Amino acid sequence: KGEAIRIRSILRSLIPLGDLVGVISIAFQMPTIAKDGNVVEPDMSAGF
């Protein structure tokens, strides 16, 4: 379908594949254990 091909091409033009691959490659912040043993947990609502 020409409409479907055109819409897919438009979306491909909007978003390069490299951008998606890089954003997926972005690393996360990890919950760590402090020297006391309590969990130092990042606030996910303020981060990636």
Binding site: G2, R6, I10, S13
Partner: protein, 394 residues
């Protein structure tokens, strides 16, 4: 009354550019040979620099509805708003299209606009839409209307790109109002009759000589001289002259006696001009201005001096006949007549003199389309290869 756009009509797509708080009119132009990308040609400054409408003219070949176009893709009509049209470039014979490639002129969404050789596919079809509410879908398209062109393949507008330093045309999502100025109507055109934009030869004597420039020197300073010569010049490309009117709209109409025009040597691309010394010289497009490069065809050498006539918004009457009609070339600003020097490959120099001689009549011989295209291709190839040679020398 109002007249409507039809198929097989020659038109130019004009856009209005406001840079530094001032207006320019720019025609969509393309040099199909050796280049595909479209550009812009200024027509607002016609007085000081002639525009090149030969590469700007387009022909409305087909005008089908959206459903008819989709049926074709799966497998003199008046233009209607909402129709998908096929624009064929008059000079190159190619078609305006969405190139599906981007120069990435800091605009990711925009595609480039250029010429394509194949009509197959949806890249060469453009839907036409009204500029204002005064027109509606299905309404007949009128000559004075402004239009919005949408690419069928990319659903993008024919857009005028301000952001980059040079003015560009590209298929983007911002809208640009395109006026469709009529150039020619093939059906109304009369055969054997002179019309604007023609490539022709100016035969002087007993059907013998041609107005031409020197050949073997290969030096443009020596080539700028204009003379009368007989022999194989009548079949060579040097004797080819473009007849260009001083108007954009209806430039392709019939030429009348006393209508001012510019003569362009096709091979060199330079315009004929009377210099202050009263000699004939070919000079550049930038230097070519109305006062010096304007010439008229007259039926008799007697100083009738008819004057300015109302300008016709159509083909008008066919007055000047190819071969049959005897024409006298007069400079408009000075009133001088173009006459051979008559001094001793005849090679009689062409000068301007205020009464001339008894035999200054000029017959006109139209050139074939193949010959004209070959001459313009020769000019373009010469220009590009000279640039290449200069770069290699540097």
């Amino acid at each position: 009354e109002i007249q409507f756009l039809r198929t097989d009509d020659e038109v130019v797509l004009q856009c209005t550019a406001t840079i530094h708080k001032e207006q320019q009119k720019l025609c969509l132009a393309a040099e199909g040979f050796g280049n595909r990308l479209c550009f812009l040609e200024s027509t607002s400054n016609s007085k000081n620099v002639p525009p090149d409408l030969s590469i700007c003219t387009f022909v409305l070949e087909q005008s089908l509805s959206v459903r008819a176009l989709q049926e074709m893709l799966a497998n003199h009509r008046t233009l209607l708003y909402g129709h998908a049209i096929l624009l064929r470039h008059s000079y190159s014979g190619m078609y305006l299209c969405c190139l599906s490639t981007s120069r990435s002129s800091t605009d990711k969404l925009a595609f480039d606009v250029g010429l394509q050789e194949d009509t197959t596919g949806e890249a060469c079809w453009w839907t036409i839409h009204p500029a204002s509410k005064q027109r509606s879908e299905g309404e007949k398209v009128r000559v004075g209307d402004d239009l919005i062109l949408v690419s069928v393949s990319s659903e993008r507008y024919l857009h005028l790109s301000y952001g980059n330093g040079s003015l560009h045309v590209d298929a983007a999502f911002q809208q640009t109002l395109w006026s469709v100025a009529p150039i020619s109507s093939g059906s109304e055109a009369a055969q054997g009759y002179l019309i604007g934009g023609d490539v022709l030869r100016l035969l002087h004597g007993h059907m013998d000589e041609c107005l031409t420039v020197p050949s073997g020197e290969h030096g443009e300073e020596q080539r700028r001289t204009v003379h009368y010569e007989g022999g194989a010049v009548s079949v060579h490309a040097r004797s080819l002259w473009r007849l260009e009117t001083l108007r954009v709209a209806w430039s392709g109409s019939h030429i009348r006696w006393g209508q001012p025009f510019r003569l362009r040597h096709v091979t060199t691309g330079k315009y004929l001009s009377l210099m202050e010394d009263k000699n004939l010289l070919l000079m550049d497009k930038e230097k070519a201005d109305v006062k010096s490069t304007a010439f008229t065809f007259r039926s008799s050498k007697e100083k009738l001096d008819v004057g300015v006539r109302k300008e016709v918004d159509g083909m008008g009457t066919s007055e000047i006949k190819y071969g049959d009609s005897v024409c006298y070339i007069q400079h408009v600003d000075t009133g001088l007549w173009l006459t051979y020097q008559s001094v001793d490959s005849i090679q009689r120099k062409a000068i301007m003199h205020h009464e001339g001689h008894m035999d200054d009549g000029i017959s006109l011989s139209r050139s074939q389309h193949e010959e004209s295209r070959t001459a313009r291709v020769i000019r373009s190839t010469v220009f590009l290869f000279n640039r290449f040679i200069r770069g290699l020398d540097a």
